[PDB]
Design a protein around this motif. Sequence first.
Motif, short mmCIF file in Angstrom:
data_model
loop_
_atom_site.label_atom_id
_atom_site.label_comp_id
_atom_site.label_asym_id
_atom_site.label_seq_id
_atom_site.Cartn_x
_atom_site.Cartn_y
_atom_site.Cartn_z
N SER A 20 0.81 -1.22 0.00
CA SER A 20 0.00 0.00 0.00
C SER A 20 0.83 1.26 0.00
N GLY A 21 2.13 1.17 -0.26
CA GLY A 21 2.99 2.33 -0.24
C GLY A 21 3.88 2.36 0.99
N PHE A 22 5.02 3.02 0.86
CA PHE A 22 5.95 3.10 1.97
C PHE A 22 6.83 4.32 1.82
N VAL A 23 7.48 4.70 2.92
CA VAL A 23 8.46 5.77 2.95
C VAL A 23 9.83 5.14 3.12
N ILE A 24 10.79 5.56 2.30
CA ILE A 24 12.13 4.99 2.31
C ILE A 24 13.12 6.14 2.46
N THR A 25 14.11 5.96 3.33
CA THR A 25 15.09 6.99 3.66
C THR A 25 16.48 6.39 3.64
N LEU A 26 17.41 7.08 2.99
CA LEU A 26 18.82 6.71 2.99
C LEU A 26 19.60 7.74 3.79
N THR A 27 20.59 7.28 4.55
CA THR A 27 21.37 8.18 5.39
C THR A 27 22.75 7.59 5.64
N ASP A 28 23.73 8.48 5.78
CA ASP A 28 25.11 8.09 6.06
C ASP A 28 25.60 8.63 7.40
N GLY A 29 24.68 8.96 8.30
CA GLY A 29 25.06 9.61 9.54
C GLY A 29 25.39 11.08 9.39
N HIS A 30 25.00 11.71 8.28
CA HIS A 30 25.23 13.13 8.04
C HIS A 30 24.08 13.72 7.24
N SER A 31 23.92 13.29 6.00
CA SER A 31 22.79 13.71 5.18
C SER A 31 21.74 12.61 5.18
N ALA A 32 20.57 12.95 4.64
CA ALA A 32 19.47 11.99 4.57
C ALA A 32 18.61 12.32 3.37
N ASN A 65 16.71 19.06 7.15
CA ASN A 65 17.26 18.82 8.49
C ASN A 65 17.49 17.33 8.66
N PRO A 66 18.63 16.80 8.19
CA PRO A 66 18.90 15.37 8.37
C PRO A 66 19.18 14.97 9.81
N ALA A 67 19.64 15.90 10.65
CA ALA A 67 19.91 15.55 12.04
C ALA A 67 18.63 15.19 12.77
N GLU A 68 17.54 15.92 12.50
CA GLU A 68 16.26 15.57 13.10
C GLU A 68 15.84 14.15 12.72
N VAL A 69 16.14 13.73 11.49
CA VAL A 69 15.79 12.37 11.07
C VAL A 69 16.71 11.36 11.74
N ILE A 70 18.01 11.67 11.81
CA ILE A 70 18.94 10.75 12.45
C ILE A 70 18.63 10.59 13.94
N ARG A 71 18.25 11.69 14.60
CA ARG A 71 17.93 11.61 16.03
C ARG A 71 16.69 10.75 16.26
N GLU A 72 15.64 10.98 15.47
CA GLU A 72 14.44 10.15 15.59
C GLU A 72 14.75 8.69 15.32
N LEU A 73 15.66 8.42 14.38
CA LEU A 73 16.07 7.05 14.10
C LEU A 73 16.75 6.42 15.31
N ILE A 74 17.63 7.18 15.98
CA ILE A 74 18.31 6.62 17.15
C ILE A 74 17.35 6.49 18.32
N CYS A 75 16.44 7.46 18.48
CA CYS A 75 15.41 7.33 19.52
C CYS A 75 14.58 6.07 19.31
N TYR A 76 14.29 5.72 18.06
CA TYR A 76 13.55 4.49 17.79
C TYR A 76 14.36 3.27 18.18
N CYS A 77 15.65 3.25 17.86
CA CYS A 77 16.48 2.10 18.20
C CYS A 77 16.62 1.95 19.71
N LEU A 78 16.79 3.07 20.43
CA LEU A 78 16.89 2.99 21.88
C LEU A 78 15.58 2.52 22.50
N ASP A 79 14.44 3.01 21.99
CA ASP A 79 13.15 2.55 22.48
C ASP A 79 12.96 1.06 22.19
N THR A 80 13.44 0.60 21.04
CA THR A 80 13.31 -0.82 20.70
C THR A 80 14.17 -1.68 21.61
#
Lengths: 213, 213, 77, 77
Positions: B30-42, B118-133
Amino acid sequence: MERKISRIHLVSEPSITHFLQVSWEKTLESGFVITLTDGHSAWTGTVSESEISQEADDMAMEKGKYVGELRKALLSGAGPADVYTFNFSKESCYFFFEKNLKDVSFRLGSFNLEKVENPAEVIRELICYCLDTIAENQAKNEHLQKENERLLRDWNDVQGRFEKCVSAKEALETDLYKRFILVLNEKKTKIRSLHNKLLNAAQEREKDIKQEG
Amino acid sequence: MERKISRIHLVSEPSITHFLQVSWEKTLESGFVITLTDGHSAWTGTVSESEISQEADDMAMEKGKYVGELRKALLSGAGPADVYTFNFSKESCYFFFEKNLKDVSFRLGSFNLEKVENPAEVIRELICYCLDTIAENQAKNEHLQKENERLLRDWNDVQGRFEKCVSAKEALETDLYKRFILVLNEKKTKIRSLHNKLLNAAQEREKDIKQEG
Amino acid sequence: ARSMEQQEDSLEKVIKDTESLFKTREKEYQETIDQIELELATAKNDMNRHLHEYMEMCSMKRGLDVQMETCRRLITQ
Amino acid sequence: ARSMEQQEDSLEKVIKDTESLFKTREKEYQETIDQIELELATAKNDMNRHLHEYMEMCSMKRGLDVQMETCRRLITQ
């Protein structure tokens, strides 16, 4: 080598969420590496063993009690209602944190975290660690979940087999009472036959008296 | 809403490791969102449901089979020896990936991931998800580990209690044989006494014959 | 008097009387012997009854014996 | 002849003989009665023996009964 990644809120930058990655070996007292990051930049500092002693001595706190306060503040293992405040100055690169009570605040640490040249390399390694940890955790889930499916099927086997012991025991005690009654009735049938034999003897005696005179 | 974070290696940037964060609901079709990141840009792109159909039709592949290939390539759920190659051009912001066989390569997808501001906002949310997991996983560990300590203590209680049934049963069967022997010896002692009574009668008879004549 | 007549007729009477008592005391002995040998045959049957009654109990409890052993094999592991 | 002497001495003999047989047939009856009442008292004791022997088995198996019930309480949960 261990590590802990924790979410903190700086009062310098209250809008977003930062991350602390503290790594040590084998204890936090022998020194540790601490890193702050906002998903863009990263500041890393190495706090030696001597610096931990000095920090505790400059506030006349016993070392063991102080190292216990680092774990509670830097390793996200405290409270509620353990309140902590975190400060960071991007100019001096000093990391401050303090434990806040209603009447006193204990300035616990002041660490210098110099800015790293390639923060993306650090952020990527941090995410690789979290992904590896998630993969390890879900493997321990599947291995522990499998042990319960086996432990509960061992329990379900004993439950069905022991109820066969109970049914066999009941079928035995029933057959013991049946055998007891079958024999008890024969002995009552024999006593009843001896009673009629005694009755018959007395009756055939009265006939022999009425006829002989 | 689900998500999956996976490590990939671009052939454009082979030195480092990138990350793909694919999020969808409730299915990848049904569709998805896909994000690539190198720890700097996204770079983030939204692949609609219509784009998934179009991608499968342009290669004459059945949809269900194609959506199954996205999960195997984008959600890190395939192989070995399922080989995949990932390409990304930071100029056109097109994400290419293909499944490589020894004699043919299937160009599976071409997604446009525009660069985020703002790739940092995306990287932070990604790490918050991993810590919550990680926190969720270690809680399920402690709750499942606690069920085995209880399941094994339930087993240890039945084991000790059933061995008391076995010892009680053995002590019963021993007392049944003891009662059987005690009575059997009385009946043998009585038969032995009747034998001597028969022997005594024959002996006292020979004395009465030798004396009477 | 007829001396030999009296002596003979009296000798024949004591021989007849002692033989009559001889057979009677032999029959009374056989009666007591038959009494003991019968009482011993009944105590002997009561003993085999006591044996078969226990052997029958063991034969019936075999079903429970097999189940209890089967259950302890599943628990001692 | 002495008619009344003969009739009386004979009447006294049949009365004496019938009474002797009268008492003998009464004793033989009591002997058979005592035989049955004894045989019935032994079958009555053999029956209470058969009862107490079963009641003793139930009294001994109580220990196993309590354990088996205790074990099924831990399993049916």
